[PDB]
Amino acid sequence: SSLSKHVDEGLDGYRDYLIKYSDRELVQFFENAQLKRQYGEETETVKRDKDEIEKPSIFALLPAY
Amino acid sequence: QRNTMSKKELEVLSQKLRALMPYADSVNITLMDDVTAAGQAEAGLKQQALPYSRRNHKGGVTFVIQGALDDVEILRARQFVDSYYRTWGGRYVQFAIELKDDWLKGRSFQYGAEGYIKMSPGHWYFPSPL
Amino acid sequence: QRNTMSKKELEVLSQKLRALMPYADSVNITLMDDVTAAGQAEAGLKQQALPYSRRNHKGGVTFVIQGALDDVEILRARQFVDSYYRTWGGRYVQFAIELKDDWLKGRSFQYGAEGYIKMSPGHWYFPSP
Amino acid sequence: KIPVTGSGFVAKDDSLRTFFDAMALQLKEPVIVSKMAARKKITGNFEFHDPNALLEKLSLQLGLIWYFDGQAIYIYDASEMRNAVVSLRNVSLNEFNNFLKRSGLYNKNYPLRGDNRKGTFYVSGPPVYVDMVVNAATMMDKQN
Amino acid sequence: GSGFVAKDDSLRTFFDAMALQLKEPVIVSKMAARKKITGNFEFHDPNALLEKLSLQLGLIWYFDGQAIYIYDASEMRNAVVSLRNVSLNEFNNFLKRSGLYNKNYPLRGDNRKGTFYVSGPPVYVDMVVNAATMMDKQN
Amino acid sequence: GSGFVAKDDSLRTFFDAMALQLKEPVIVSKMAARKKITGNFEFHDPNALLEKLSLQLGLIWYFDGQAIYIYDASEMRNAVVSLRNVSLNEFNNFLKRSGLYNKNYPLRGDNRKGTFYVSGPPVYVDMVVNAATMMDKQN
Numbered sequence: 001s002s003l004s005k006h007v008d009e010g011l012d013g014y015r016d017y018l019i020k021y022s023d024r025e026l027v028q029f030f031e032n033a034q035l036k037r038q039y040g041e042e043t044e045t046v047k048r049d050k051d052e053i054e055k056p057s058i059f060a061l062l063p064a065y
Numbered sequence: 066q067r068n069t070m071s072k073k074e075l076e077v078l079s080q081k082l083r084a085l086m087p088y089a090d091s092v093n094i095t096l097m098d099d100v101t102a103a104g105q106a107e108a109g110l111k112q113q114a115l116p117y118s119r120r121n122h123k124g125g126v127t128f129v130i131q132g133a134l135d136d137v138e139i140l141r142a143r144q145f146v147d148s149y150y151r152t153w154g155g156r157y158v159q160f161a162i163e164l165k166d167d168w169l170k171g172r173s174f175q176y177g178a179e180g181y182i183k184m185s186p187g188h189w190y191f192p193s194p195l
Numbered sequence: 196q197r198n199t200m201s202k203k204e205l206e207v208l209s210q211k212l213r214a215l216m217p218y219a220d221s222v223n224i225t226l227m228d229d230v231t232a233a234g235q236a237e238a239g240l241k242q243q244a245l246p247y248s249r250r251n252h253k254g255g256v257t258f259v260i261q262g263a264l265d266d267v268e269i270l271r272a273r274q275f276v277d278s279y280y281r282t283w284g285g286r287y288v289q290f291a292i293e294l295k296d297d298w299l300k301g302r303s304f305q306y307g308a309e310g311y312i313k314m315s316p317g318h319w320y321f322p323s324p
Numbered sequence: 325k326i327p328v329t330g331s332g333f334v335a336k337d338d339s340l341r342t343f344f345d346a347m348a349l350q351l352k353e354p355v356i357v358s359k360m361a362a363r364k365k366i367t368g369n370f371e372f373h374d375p376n377a378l379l380e381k382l383s384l385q386l387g388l389i390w391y392f393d394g395q396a397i398y399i400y401d402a403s404e405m406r407n408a409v410v411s412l413r414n415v416s417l418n419e420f421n422n423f424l425k426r427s428g429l430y431n432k433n434y435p436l437r438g439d440n441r442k443g444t445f446y447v448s449g450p451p452v453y454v455d456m457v458v459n460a461a462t463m464m465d466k467q468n
Numbered sequence: 469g470s471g472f473v474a475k476d477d478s479l480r481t482f483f484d485a486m487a488l489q490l491k492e493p494v495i496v497s498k499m500a501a502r503k504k505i506t507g508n509f510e511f512h513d514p515n516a517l518l519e520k521l522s523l524q525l526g527l528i529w530y531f532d533g534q535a536i537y538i539y540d541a542s543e544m545r546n547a548v549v550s551l552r553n554v555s556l557n558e559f560n561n562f563l564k565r566s567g568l569y570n571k572n573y574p575l576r577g578d579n580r581k582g583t584f585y586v587s588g589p590p591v592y593v594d595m596v597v598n599a600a601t602m603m604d605k606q607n
Numbered sequence: 608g609s610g611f612v613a614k615d616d617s618l619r620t621f622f623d624a625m626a627l628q629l630k631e632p633v634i635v636s637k638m639a640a641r642k643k644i645t646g647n648f649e650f651h652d653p654n655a656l657l658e659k660l661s662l663q664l665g666l667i668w669y670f671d672g673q674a675i676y677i678y679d680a681s682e683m684r685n686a687v688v689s690l691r692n693v694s695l696n697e698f699n700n701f702l703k704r705s706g707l708y709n710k711n712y713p714l715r716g717d718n719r720k721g722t723f724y725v726s727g728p729p730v731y732v733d734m735v736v737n738a739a740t741m742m743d744k745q746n
């Protein structure tokens with residue numbers, strides 16, 4: 001809870017390396033299947049236009065890379 | 066109930082229409098009442114069990130028949146209008162039968178003076194008050 | 196309201212214009228108001244419901260018609276402009292129809308005092324009007 | 325370039341964070357929208373002339389809870405409201421309400437439920453309101 | 469003048485539309501968010517519409533003063549607690565003045581004793597047990 | 608006069624160009640460096656342009672006397688800290704006499720007590736908390 005927000009500051013270069021070389025159409029699949037898994041079937045589908053300011057998680061880049 | 070002509074100048078119209086129609090020997094002009102032209106159009110539109118909406122305004126009325134009618138309510142509403150046009154003309158009362166689908170086609174909404182359409186479980190649209 | 200010729204200076208202009216057209220008998224010169232020439236052009240431009248902007252200056256006016264007009268608005272604009280040019284000519288008032296494309300088609304924007312166009316969830320555009 | 329005569333905000337599929345940051349000038353404080361309440365979208369022609377009354381109505385039609393702590397405006401959705409119950413060994417509830425009223429953190433929409441001169445009460449609301457009330461209540465008894 | 473037209477909603481879409489006529493926000497659980505509803509409704513008396521719908525659909529609801537929690541009926545929990553040095557009448561007098569007294573789910577027990585029984589929604593039972601055990605430790 | 612014609616800059620090449628009219632360096636964080644801006648800007652009143660653009664973009668800023676820090680609004684943190692043996696009205700005179708007193712984010716609390724509530728930028732909160740627990744250690 002508290003050490004996970006400390007390791008987030010320590011893990012910005014690896015997330016930026018995984019973003020540059022993973023696929024855009026495949027990270028969006030692992031992002032929507034995670035939201036469909038956690039909250040339910042009535043969850044709004046995430047589209048491409050999040051990519052400007054919102055960053056994907058480390059559990060969606062790592063299978064898609 | 067919509068003209069202001071006296072007895073003298075109605076003979077001028079009954080002679081300028083006779084000179085305009087050469088086969089006619091004489092033209093007879095009868096003054097018909099105005100509320101019996103719309104009460105017969107409403108009573109005939111009620112016997113066929115059709116949904117309608119009368120719009121009264123100054124100098125003419127208009128009956129609007131909309132919705133998703135079925136196959137018998139189109140034939141029964143087309144046989145009455147063409148039997149009414151033969152006797153009254155399309156000058157005073159106008160029938161507006163329009164076949165259109167379910168408005169707000171599959172959307173849930175909260176109508177009345179503060180309206181919003183629900184495009185999705187997480188999406189709100191705020192048009193004119195539905 | 197733009198020339199100050201006298202009676203004799205108008206009569207020598209009529210006698211020096213009659214010599215140029217040999218078929219004519221006499222040239223008749225009438226003076227018209229300068230206000231109704233630019234008034235009929237605006238009263239006809241408001242009736243067709245076209246967006247416009249008027250730029251008054253000395254010695255002529257000009258009307259600018261911008262925007263992403265649709266198909267029927269540039270048919271009514273040609274039918275009015277080519278019917279005004281037949282009556283008055285293009286020496287005083289001139290129309291300038293230029294058509295462009297709309298930036299705010301799928302965009303969300305704020306209008307009013309401090310206007311901006313949000314081109315993206317992470318992009319702002321501050322225009323200078 | 326932007327031809328409309330009046331003043332207002334037009335949102336085409338804005339996602340409730342870009343929408344409330346546009347209200348963050350008429351409101352004179354910055355707005356902080358949470359992560360779960362930013363998945364909802366809103367579209368339409370809006371105008372702001374008393375946004376503290378507009379935020380209350382849209383927080384009930386959309387389903388949201390909000391809180392203003394003097395520097396910013398926090399916005400969560402309704403399913404993030406948490407509850408707590410704490411006991412004061414040596415100060416009263418009427419003593420704690422004077423600390424909240426004098427400082428300026430007293431919120432009349434989420435009051436404190438309890439007996440007027442006792443030690444126990446029940447607080448519930450947004451997570452930045454509860455985690456301040458619990459932390460100051462257990463940091464005044466250790467001082468006293 | 470008002471009203472919702474439900475077409476296959478999910479009881480979280482539905483009850484937020486009633487959250488304006490009711491002056492409090494509504495929190496629907498995730499097991500009671502699976503049931504669905506259709507129909508043309510009319511929100512002119514919502515405190516009786518919520519009571520009629522919670523018995524036809526099968527639900528339990530609790531309003532503490534800030535929000536309206538809605539659970540389905542299979543989430544009802546129960547517990548028995550014993551108080552050492554305070555009786556039931558002063559704890560019920562605490563709830564009558566604190567405004568947390570719910571007449572639909574009262575406290576079952578002897579009127580001047582320590583042991584009693586409580587059952588209701590999981591936000592009401594978890595508050596009543598913690599408030600009951602946090603007064604005897606204070607005494 | 609002067610100005611800056613921004614064409615798809617990234618809020619770090621913009622606020623460095625404003626950092627000449629502002630007479631201090633500008634430190635933009637990397638979560639507020641992903642937003643972009645474009646347009647012809649004229650710097651003739653920078654202290655009101657930064658105040659207006661922080662609300663139109665959604666930002667928080669702070670000037671401690673040597674530099675101007677700029678974060679986005681979702682990085683604002685808060686804390687409540689207890690002073691055992693020093694009043695708030697004395698600590699607030701320490702901030703007024705030093706130069707770190709910011710009237711946009713003041714200290715909410717009782718005027719003669721030990722507990723208060725502070726919120727603002729992370730460089731202002733982590734200075735006020737550390738200089739308050741280093742004033743309980745001195746007494």
